[PDB]
Swiss-Prot record, chain A:
It comes from the Eukaryota. It comes from Homo sapiens. Belongs to the AAA ATPase family. This is 26S proteasome regulatory subunit 8. Component of the 26S proteasome, a multiprotein complex involved in the ATP-dependent degradation of ubiquitinated proteins. This complex plays a key role in the maintenance of protein homeostasis by removing misfolded or damaged proteins, which could impair cellular functions, and by removing proteins whose functions are no longer required. Therefore, the proteasome participates in numerous cellular processes, including cell cycle progression, apoptosis, or DNA damage repair. The chain holds residues 291 to 348 of 406 of the full protein. Component of the 19S proteasome regulatory particle complex. The 26S proteasome consists of a 20S core particle (CP) and two 19S regulatory subunits (RP). The regulatory particle is made of a lid composed of 9 subunits, a base containing 6 ATPases including PSMC5 and few additional components. Component of a complex with USP49 and RUVBL1. Interacts with PRPF19. Interacts with TRIM5. Interacts with NDC80. Interacts with PAAF1. Interacts, in vitro, with the thyroid hormone receptor (in a thyroid hormone T3-dependent manner) and with retinoid X receptor (RXR). Interacts with ERCC6. It is found in: Cytoplasm; Nucleus.
UniProtKB/Swiss-Prot annotation, chain B:
Component of the 26S proteasome, a multiprotein complex involved in the ATP-dependent degradation of ubiquitinated proteins. This complex plays a key role in the maintenance of protein homeostasis by removing misfolded or damaged proteins, which could impair cellular functions, and by removing proteins whose functions are no longer required. Therefore, the proteasome participates in numerous cellular processes, including cell cycle progression, apoptosis, or DNA damage repair. Component of the 19S proteasome regulatory particle complex. The 26S proteasome consists of a 20S core particle (CP) and two 19S regulatory subunits (RP). The regulatory particle is made of a lid composed of 9 subunits including SEM1, a base containing 6 ATPases and few additional components. Belongs to the TREX-2 complex (transcription and export complex 2), composed of at least ENY2, GANP, PCID2, SEM1, and either centrin CETN2 or CETN3. Component of the homologous recombination repair (HR) complex composed of ERCC5/XPG, BRCA2, PALB2, DSS1 and RAD51. Interacts with the C-terminal of BRCA2. The gene is SEM1. One of its GO terms (biological process) is double-strand break repair via homologous recombination. It comes from Homo sapiens (Human). It is found in: Nucleus. Its main location: nucleus. The keyword Nucleus applies. One of its GO terms (cellular component) is nucleoplasm. The keyword Nucleus applies. This is 26S proteasome complex subunit SEM1. Keywords: Nucleus, Proteasome.
Curated annotation (Swiss-Prot), chain C:
It comes from Homo sapiens. Induction: By FOXO4; expression in embryonic stem cells (ESCs) is mediated by FOXO4. Phosphorylated by AMPK. Transmembrane segments: none annotated. It comes from the Eukaryota. Component of the 19S proteasome regulatory particle complex. The 26S proteasome consists of a 20S core particle (CP) and two 19S regulatory subunits (RP). The regulatory particle is made of a lid composed of 9 subunits including PSMD11, a base containing 6 ATPases and few additional components. It is found in: Nucleus; Cytoplasm, Cytosol. Belongs to the proteasome subunit S9 family. The chain holds residues 318 to 370 of 422 of the full protein. Component of the 26S proteasome, a multiprotein complex involved in the ATP-dependent degradation of ubiquitinated proteins. This complex plays a key role in the maintenance of protein homeostasis by removing misfolded or damaged proteins, which could impair cellular functions, and by removing proteins whose functions are no longer required. Therefore, the proteasome participates in numerous cellular processes, including cell cycle progression, apoptosis, or DNA damage repair. In the complex, PSMD11 is required for proteasome assembly. Highly expressed in embryonic stem cells (ESCs). Expression decreases as ESCs differentiate. This is 26S proteasome non-ATPase regulatory subunit 11.
Curated annotation (Swiss-Prot), chain D:
The gene is PSMD6. The keyword rRNA-binding does not apply. Transmembrane segments: none annotated. Belongs to the proteasome subunit S10 family. It comes from the Eukaryota. Gene3D superfamilies: 1.25.40.570. SMART domains: PINT. Component of the 26S proteasome, a multiprotein complex involved in the ATP-dependent degradation of ubiquitinated proteins. This complex plays a key role in the maintenance of protein homeostasis by removing misfolded or damaged proteins, which could impair cellular functions, and by removing proteins whose functions are no longer required. Therefore, the proteasome participates in numerous cellular processes, including cell cycle progression, apoptosis, or DNA damage repair. It comes from Homo sapiens (Human). This is 26S proteasome non-ATPase regulatory subunit 6. GO terms for cellular component: cytosol; extracellular region; ficolin-1-rich granule lumen; nucleoplasm; proteasome accessory complex; proteasome complex; proteasome regulatory particle; secretory granule lumen. InterPro entries: PCI_dom (IPR000717), Rpn7/CSN1 (IPR019585), Rpn7_N (IPR045135), RPN7_PSMD6_C (IPR049549), TPR-like_helical_dom_sf (IPR011990), WH_DNA-bd_sf (IPR036390).
Length: 58, 59, 53, 376
């Protein structure tokens, strides 16, 4: 069971007894790079011309 | 059937050039054909188009 | 901005007038297209070349 | 990658010779060294016929053995610690390494088996792209047509318009690699809007190609529309100084010069590969167009007018038209007694009829041929 929500401060305690959520991994906001990457993935879907600096955009 | 064919081929000939061809035995084909012809014409023409006009310059 | 644009309008106008001069006609001696459109032949047939082509 | 340039330079060495023993050859060899290539060295030597330094070959093969060893070993560690998306990647480095080692069958098989994995799209598609890439590299054909179909499906399903553009650049360049310029026209001509695929060549080269083929197979008003008025060309077509000069010379009725630049560029094509022996097909055609375009406004005109215009002697000009007239590729006909030329327009039917019959015959010959086979 992946149970993936937000603000771990919301989830109850009984769901945090150190052993019970095997690997707690956290997502980071998306910076220039990640965005840039994400930006390049989504912009790849549509028909994007040349002379297009995505970085400037992020 | 193949053997029969082979036999037929043998009877029709051997042959000299055919043997050589067989020995040689590729490549492609591209798409369509005709007519190749000679070559070295265009520039030759220009080489002359100059010369021509150069001759016509000489004219 | 609108001025230099007149060149466009002028062009579209000339093209039409011509198409209407040769509209109903054949072997129309070109000097006639000229005097009708009121312009020198040389650039008329200069254009009619462009249109044909 | 594999970097095409190796292939282009290779072809350059093949040339009518030309030997030389100049930039080219040592450029190649220089990229054998840093590429520890092999399958060439015997392939090339057997082709060009100039081998030497059996030592160098051994060194290259040795290092190759080292790395193929290494990647094999890496893969071995994965089998015990997979790593699905990982395994396939080490493979991509395997067959890819076959690309650096430029061995066809090997990267072929390697990639294939990686498709059984791949799973995603960039791996199952872009990898294919590379597989065909090899095709372009070797100068094959079918090997590509069957894979451009694959990628075609993969793109038709989902994907995006970013891969479709490279795709059209490949397909296009291919179309040029044959006599199929019409298909390359729209394909390439539309490739100017986007061109991220510098993998093959640069941008101004590509430009010259799309402008070349454009000039060749586009109509006069759509030449002016899509090329003479190319926002992406004006900035580039100013970067050049040859094809453009010819393109303009045509469009604007400045023939006589058009010819010279035509010959020039012709002498620049035989150097390329995409055309190879097409340098003879291109110019032939580019001769007709002008002759055509020159007459179209005349129901009669005199030779000396033409010859004068183009700046050649009559006799040679007559001699040229004689090539195109009998083939009904040109609607002229000549009167030498008076040195005059009159133009007989053609009928639409006359065009198709000649084309329809030709096409019908091609289908008939193929139908019957394989008919007998299936019949027996």
């Amino acid at each position: 069971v992946i149970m993936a929500t937000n603000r771990i401060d919301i989830l109850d305690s009984a769901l945090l007894r150190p052993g019970r959520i095997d690997r707690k991994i956290e997502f980071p906001p998306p910076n220039e790079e990640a965005r840039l990457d994400i930006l390049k993935i989504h912009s790849r879907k549509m028909n994007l011309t040349r002379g297009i600096n995505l970085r400037k955009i992020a | 059937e193949k053997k029969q064919p082979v036999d037929l081929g043998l009877l029709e000939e051997d042959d000299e050039f055919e043997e050589f061809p067989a020995e040689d035995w590729d490549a492609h084909v591209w798409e369509d054909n005709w007519d190749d012809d000679n070559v070295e014409d265009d520039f030759s023409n220009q080489l002359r188009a100059e010369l021509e006009k150069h001759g016509y310059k000489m004219e | 901005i609108i001025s230099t644009h007149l060149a466009k309008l002028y062009d579209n106008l000339l093209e039409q007038n011509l198409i209407r001069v040769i509209e109903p006609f054949s072997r129309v001696q070109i000097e006639h297209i000229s005097s009708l459109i009121k312009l020198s032949k040389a650039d008329v047939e200069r254009k009619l070349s462009q249109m044909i082509l | 990658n594999p970097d095409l340039r190796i292939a282009q330079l290779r072809f350059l060495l093949s040339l009518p010779e030309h030997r030389g023993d100049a930039a080219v050859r040592d450029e190649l060899m220089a990229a054998v060294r840093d590429n520890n290539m092999a399958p060439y060295y015997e392939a090339l030597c057997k082709s060009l016929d100039w081998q030497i330094d059996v030592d160098l070959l051994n060194k290259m093969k040795k290092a190759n053995e080292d790395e193929l060893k290494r990647l094999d070993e890496e893969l071995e560690d994965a089998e015990k610690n997979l790593g699905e998306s990982e395994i396939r990647d080490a493979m991509m480095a395997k067959a890819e390494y076959l690309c650096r080692i430029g061995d066809k069958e090997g990267a072929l098989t390697a990639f294939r088996k990686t498709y059984d994995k791949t799973v995603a799209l960039g791996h199952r598609l872009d990898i294919v792209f590379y597989l065909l890439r090899i095709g372009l590299f070797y100068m094959d054909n079918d090997l590509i047509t069957r894979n451009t179909e694959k990628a075609k499906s993969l793109i038709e399903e989902g994907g995006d318009w970013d891969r479709r553009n490279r795709l059209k650049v490949y397909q296009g360049l291919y179309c040029v690699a044959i006599r199929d310029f019409k298909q390359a026209a729209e394909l390439f001509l539309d490739t100017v809007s986007t061109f991220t695929s510098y993998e093959l060549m640069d941008y101004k080269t590509f430009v010259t190609y799309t402008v070349y083929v454009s000039m060749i197979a586009l109509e006069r008003p759509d030449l002016r529309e899509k090329v003479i008025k190319g926002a992406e060309i004006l900035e580039v077509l100013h970067s050049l100084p040859a094809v453009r000069q010819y393109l303009f010379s045509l469009y604007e009725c400045r023939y006589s010069v058009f010819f010279q630049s035509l010959a020039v560029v012709e002498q620049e094509m035989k150097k390329d590969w995409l055309f190879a022996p097409h340098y003879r097909y291109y110019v032939r055609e580019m001769r007709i167009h002008a002759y055509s375009q020159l007459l179209e406004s005349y129901r009669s005109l005199t030779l000396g007018y033409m010859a004068e215009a183009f700046g050649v002697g009559v006799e040679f000009i007559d001699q040229e038209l004689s090539r195109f007239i009998a083939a009904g590729r040109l609607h002229c006909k000549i009167d030498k007694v008076n040195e005059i030329v009159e133009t007989n327009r053609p009928d639409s039917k006359n065009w198709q009829y000649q084309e329809t019959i030709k096409k019908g015959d091609l289908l008939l010959n193929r139908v019957q041929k394989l008919s007998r086979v299936i019949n027996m």
